[PDB]
Amino acid sequence: ENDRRTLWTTPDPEANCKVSEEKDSKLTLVLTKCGSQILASVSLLVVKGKFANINNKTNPGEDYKKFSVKLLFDANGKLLTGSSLDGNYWNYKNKDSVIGSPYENAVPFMPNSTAYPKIINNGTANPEDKKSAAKKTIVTNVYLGGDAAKPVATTISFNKETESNCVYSITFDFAWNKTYKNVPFDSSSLTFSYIAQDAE
Amino acid sequence: ENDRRTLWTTPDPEANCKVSEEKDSKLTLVLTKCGSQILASVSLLVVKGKFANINNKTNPGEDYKKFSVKLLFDANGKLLTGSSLDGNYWNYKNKDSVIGSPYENAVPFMPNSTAYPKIINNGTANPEDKKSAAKKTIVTNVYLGGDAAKPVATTISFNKETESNCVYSITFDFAWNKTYKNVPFDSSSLTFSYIAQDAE
Amino acid sequence: ENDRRTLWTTPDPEANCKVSEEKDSKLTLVLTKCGSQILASVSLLVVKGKFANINNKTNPGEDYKKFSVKLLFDANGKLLTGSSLDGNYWNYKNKDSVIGSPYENAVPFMPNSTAYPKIINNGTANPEDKKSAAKKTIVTNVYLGGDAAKPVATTISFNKETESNCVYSITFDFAWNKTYKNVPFDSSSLTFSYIAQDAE
């Protein structure tokens, strides 16, 4: 009904995500359709590993101050193995859980091919043929422990990845310059939208 | 018709809200059902009292430099007395207005208990199933006068309040570090979403 | 069916917008009806002229550091002549393309008159007598190249313009202080919502 309009991890998932090692994080992502767009809410709590309690005082160095989460999808919109997120509880909504069986098609939840092409190349491109790099991209912040003093630079990129010969993709890139001393990666929630691929 | 999907005060309200004194502010809040999520828009013009002409030069203190707006719901999603907003014109959409008679049940507009649960704040071990307080929070900025130079740090908290045996809450926290000389607290409009509760 | 819910510039549009010269930019604007709000997504690529390759080091004046795009509408919600945007492939969705006929009436997709009204005389007397300019405004940054290091102050504004006896107006205002050196104007995507005009 309204539930085929939503695809999510669950509102309160079990560990379902690899940031650093297997199942070290809980990603709550809900994708909903309002017509031609997807309306999305995301959140990330990391419960163990390299980012469960950041200390950039005792661990400075690029690799302790950034990471990314990738949703990779095949032609029908099925999650592919190379993904950060586990498929077990990624499915269509049902009264606060997921449908019994794993889904066959979710093309209408995928970021548009046309608005978000895989590669743009404006080296030798005439101006009227030029495409937008930036357009595939939402740049905002989230906040550790929902504290304004603790921003984390968030980039959401559509159809950026090539991993696993995927045809669609949602990437969440996270980075910070503050040197956070003993702060869990526990994010505020973030609203975002993108243009949906057309079914059939 | 499609106004059953909207619960919204009014597009243009009479002073309907308490920041510092009774009916001292005009809160515009619309909540629309986009399936499993609520898409909200919010503005706050304070019309009289302590925040109606901010002067941190003359009043340098903490209590002049922040305030908070609490909406308190019961089990049926009806608005409780403790709330900053008054329920006279808080109701479903009829054309450009509300339905005459106050609503029985708005539970499906409330923030999801599962996504955003009650957390009794005690020293808690084992982060691998501690429920996240950050998740319940959207952190962003509104701009006073719609001017980029005049930011206000804005925290939107779901299911945070303990007051009046509320089951559900939506709390707007406005704070600013900058020292403003005669600026009316007059916010830019802010878009946000959250995961909705389900019903019968 | 559901396509009559989307008023859009194509997802992958031809040069369609005047920032500086006729047809110097590709504006992507998607409007979808979600109940009583419009859920919008907006992005701007400039391909020629004065902002096709910003260099505030060679061009340091204000006129090279800011520009605005005006959508102007009439009482049917159809585009007018003064509009930045060429109203020739600006139509209701049909599949991944656009409908045969030009779009007739689209009043349901306009910013709400009551919510965002035209400015008059303001006074401290409060029988009802306050107007918030800010309420009419969403203020945020977008990011050139989708780079965190390259913010641009963005203001969206509803029913503000007076040009060509317009009833309804959407205006995107861009402004930066940073001195960009050989940066195409190519904005990261922006999600936003506003209250719709009530259809009849």
Author numbering:
A (entry chain A), B (entry chain C), C (entry chain B): 395 to 594
What does the paper say about this structure?
Here, we investigate the tropism of HAdV-D49, focusing on the fiber knob protein as the major mediator of cellular attachment and evaluate the potential utility of a pseudotyped HAdV-C5/D49K vector to infect a range of cancer cell lines. Structurally and biologically we demonstrate that HAdV-D49 knob protein is unable to engage CD46, while potential interaction with coxsackievirus and adenovirus receptor (CAR) is extremely limited by extension of the DG loop.
This HAdV-D49.KO1.K mutant, harbors the KO1 mutations S408E and P409A in the fiber knob AB loop, previously shown to ablate CAR binding in HAdV-C5K. As predicted, we did not observe binding between either fiber knob protein and CD46. However, we did observe HAdV-D49K binding to CAR with a detectable 0.19 μM affinity which was ablated by the KO1 mutation. However, no IC50 could be derived by using HAdV-D49K to block CD46 on CHO-BC1 cells, where HAdV-D49K was unable to achieve >20% inhibition of antibody binding, suggesting weak or incidental CD46 interactions. Therefore, these data support the findings from SPR and transduction experiments that HAdV-D49K may bind CAR with low affinity but does not bind CD46. In CHO-K1 cells, HAdV-C5/D49K and the KO1 mutant were the only viruses that achieved efficient transduction. In support of this, we show that a mutant vector, HAdV-C5/D49.KO1.K, containing mutations within the fiber knob domain which ablate CAR affinity, retained the ability to efficiently transduce cells in the absence of any detectable binding to CAR.
